[PDB]
What does this fold into?
Amino acid sequence: YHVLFDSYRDNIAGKSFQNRLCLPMPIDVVYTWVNGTDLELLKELTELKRSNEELRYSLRSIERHAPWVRNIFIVTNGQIPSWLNLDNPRVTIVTHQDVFRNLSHLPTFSSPAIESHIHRIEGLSQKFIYLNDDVMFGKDVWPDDFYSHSKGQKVYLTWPVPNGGSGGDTFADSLRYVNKILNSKFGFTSRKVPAHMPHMIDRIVMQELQDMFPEEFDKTSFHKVRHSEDMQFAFSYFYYLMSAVQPLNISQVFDEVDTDQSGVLSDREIRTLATRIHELPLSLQDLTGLEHMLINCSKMLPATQESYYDPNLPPVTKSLVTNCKPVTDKIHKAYKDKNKYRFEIMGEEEIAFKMIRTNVSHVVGQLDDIRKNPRKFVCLNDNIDHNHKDAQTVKAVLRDFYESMFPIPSQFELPR
Amino acid sequence: YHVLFDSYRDNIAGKSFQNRLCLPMPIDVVYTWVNGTDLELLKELTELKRSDNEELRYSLRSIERHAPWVRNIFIVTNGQIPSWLNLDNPRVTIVTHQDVFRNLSHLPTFSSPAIESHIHRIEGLSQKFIYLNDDVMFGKDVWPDDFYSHSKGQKVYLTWPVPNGGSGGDTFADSLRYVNKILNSKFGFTSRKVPAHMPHMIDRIVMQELQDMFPEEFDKTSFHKVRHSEDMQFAFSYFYYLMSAVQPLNISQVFDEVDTDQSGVLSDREIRTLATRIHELPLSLQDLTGLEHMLINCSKMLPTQESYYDPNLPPVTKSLVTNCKPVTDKIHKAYKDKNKYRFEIMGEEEIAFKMIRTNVSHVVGQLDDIRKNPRKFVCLNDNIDHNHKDAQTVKAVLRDFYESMFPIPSQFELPREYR
Ligand SMILES: *[C@@H]1O[C@H](CO)[C@@H](O)[C@H](O)[C@H]1NC(C)=O
Ligand SMILES: *[C@@H]1O[C@H](CO)[C@@H](O)[C@H](O)[C@H]1NC(C)=O
Ligand SMILES: *[C@@H]1O[C@H](CO)[C@@H](O)[C@H](O)[C@H]1NC(C)=O
Ligand SMILES: *[C@@H]1O[C@H](CO)[C@@H](O)[C@H](O)[C@H]1NC(C)=O
It folds into this structure.
C-alpha cells in the first residue's frame, strides 16, 4: 500500500523522482480513416464539377506489439465504424466538428487540414501517437523508442528534401514551401524529411507552434483539397522541436555558479564564473579585469565578512550581476544560444518503407524481407494499378501477409 | 483511492509495465578507501622486510548533490573509519572483510583487486550498484539512464585499445594481457579496449556468473596479497564477459516467434515465414518444395482451422520440428549464437581524465578546463612526487577546487572544528 510511495521516497535526498524514472504516462493513439465509396466520391465529383482493410490490422498491431497505449481515437468525416467495438470504452470516434475551430470547414476533403488540428481533442494525454492507417508495429515498441528524458524526444530522419524530390510533385512542392518558410524564419539550414512512421507528438510543443504560426496553419487548413503549399504534420513539429530557441536566463547561470545558495559569490566562485565566461587558456589579467569592471559597475551605480583578494571588491549579488551590463554582454557573447528542447537523430535503422509496385514477384520479395527481418515500424501503402490482370492477386498476397502477421482475434472487433 | 491503483494499470492490456518502464531501482554506491595510518605503514614494512587528500568526503558531497537517487552507500576499508564520518547516519555502512572474502586467510589483502573481486558479495546489496574508487566524482546530473537502458542494455565506456606491443609495462599492462589471453582462450581473439576509469554499474548476477565461469583465476587473484601480473582485473573482465557472453539457441523461442497464431500448428503462411527466415533471398518455389519434402520424410520416418496445400503434411507441432536433425542444423547455421546480455558502446565524449605532474600551470589549466566545461565523471589521478616544494601548493589548489565544487557539508559528515 505505502511500499510503492516509500520505494521512490527511499533515497538519500528523501524526494520522489517519478517524473524522471518512469517516463510520461499515459499515451494515446490517434488514427485517421476515410472511406472512398459512394457518397464521398459523389461529393468529390460534384465539387470538381462546381469548381484496403488496413485499419483492422493496424489496431491488431496496437494490441499485440504496443500494449502500453491508453486510448485510440479515429477522426472521421462522420463515417460510423464498420467493424469497431464500441462496448469497450477504450476506443472512441471523434468527428471533425470537435477538432475544427470553425464549423465552416467541416467538408474537409484534405489530409493536412485534418492533421493540423489533432491536438484539440478533449481527453487526450500530454503526448499522443499519430498513425495514417497504412503503418503498424512489427516488433515490440516501447515509449523509450520515441522519447527518452535524457536525450529528449527521438526524431527519425530520412532522405533530404532536394535530393528525394522531383518536379511536378504536389507533395514535394509543399515540403519545399515549408522549407522556404522555416529557412526564412529560423535561418538557412540543411533539412531532412522525417520518416513515414507512427510519430509521437506533444500537445504543448504543437500548441506553441500554433501560437507562433497561427496565420499559416489557418491558411493551410482553409484549403478544401490537398494544395501545392500545405504544411506537413510531422516535418513542422519535428523541425520546430529541433530549432526551438530558449532565452538566456542569467539568473539560472548565477544560481548554478553560486553553489552556496547564499546569493553572494566568494573568491573561488568568481573563478568558475570567469572560466565559463572566458575561453581557454585563462590568464590572471582577464580575471583582474573582470574584478575591475565589477568594482567600476558597483561604484558608478549607487547601491560574515567573507575575505576576498582585492579589498576594494564589494560583495556581488543578483542585484549587482544582473544589472551589470558589461558582464551580461560578455556572458551573452560567450554562451551560445541553447535549444529549448532536446532530441536524438538516427536514420532508417528499423523502418520498413516498402513500396508496392503491382508486381507480385517483387511484392512477395518485399514481404519476405519484412518477415526475415522483423522491424519496429512497417509502411505498406496500398498502391495498385487496378488496371492489371493480376492486380487482385497483389491484394490477395498482401492480405495473406496481413493474416500471417496478426491472426489472433482482438477485443476491438464484434464476434460475428 | 481506486484512481491511484488504476493509474499504473490503466491500459489496453490491463497489465502493469512498471518493471520495464521505471528503470532498474534501487541502486547503491560502493567505495574502496584506504588510509596511510601508522598501523598500515607498519604492516607494509613488516611484509616487505619478511618477503591524505580526503577525496572521500568530497565524493560523498558529489553523490549527495548530483546523484540523489541512490539508496545506500557502502564503503569497504581495513577496519578503519574517518573520525568526521557520520556512522550514526543509518544510510552509510562500513564493511569489513569478514563478510566479503570467502576465506579468512586473505584478510591482509593489501591489494585492490582482491577487494574488488569480492565487493559484490556484501549482504543487502542491490542487484545493480555503482563502483566508486575513492578518487572519481560525479558532475552535471547523473541518472540510471547514463549507465543502463532497457532497450539497449548497459552502456560500456571504452577509451583506447590495448597496444599488445609488449616489451614493457610494470604492473598495469601485464594484467591486461593476462585477462586478454584468458578471454582469447575462452571466447576467441579480437581487438579489445581498456574500460574507462569511472563509476561503473555492476550486476550481481553477471558478476556471480563470471566468478562461477572462471573460478580458478579468481581465487588466484584473491590469493595475491600484492598486485602482480597474475591477477584478473575487475572492469575488464566484467565488461568483456558481458559483451562476449553467448547462449545456445532454444528451438521453443524461434518456434513461438514463427507461430503467430499461438496454436502450436503451422499453416502455409507460418511455413513460408520460417522458410524465408532460414533461407536467403530470392526465395523460390524450389526451396519450399524441398522443405515440404523434408517435412514429409521426417514425418514418415517415425485442433481446428486445418488447411494445407499438400495433403501429405501432418500437423507440424513442436515435436515434429524439434527432432528433425537437418533442418535444425540449417536453422543453427542461419541464426548463429548471439550475445545473451545487451550492451551499448561509446567513447570519450563525457569523461574527464586529468593527471598532476607538479607543473603548477598545467594542473591549474586542467582544473580551469574542468570548471569551464563540467563533465559527468571526473577522474583526478594524484601522483605528486611530494619532494617538490610546490607539493603543498598543488595540495592547496586541489583543496580549493574540491571546496569550490562542493562547499556544502554532506549528510554523512559531522561538522566539527569549523575552519
Ligand atoms: C530565471 O531563473 C530564475 C531562477 O530563480 C527564475 O526565478 C526566473 O523566473 C527565470 N527567469 C525567466 C525570465 O524565465
Ligand atoms: C516484375 O519484375 C521483374 C523483374 O525481373 C520483371 O521481369 C517482370 O516482368 C515484372 N512483372 C510484371 C508483371 O511487371
Ligand atoms: C527452452 O525450451 C524449452 C522447451 O521445452 C522450454 O520449456 C524452456 O523454458 C526453454 N528454456 C529457456 C532458458 O529458454
Ligand atoms: C609548466 O607548464 C607550462 C604550461 O602551462 C609549460 O609551458 C612549462 O614549460 C612547464 N614547465 C616549466 C618547467 O615551467
In short: The two ends of chain A are 43 Å apart (CA to CA). Residues A 249, 251-252, 255 surround 2-acetamido-2-deoxy-beta-D-glucopyranose (ligand 1) (CB under 6 Å).
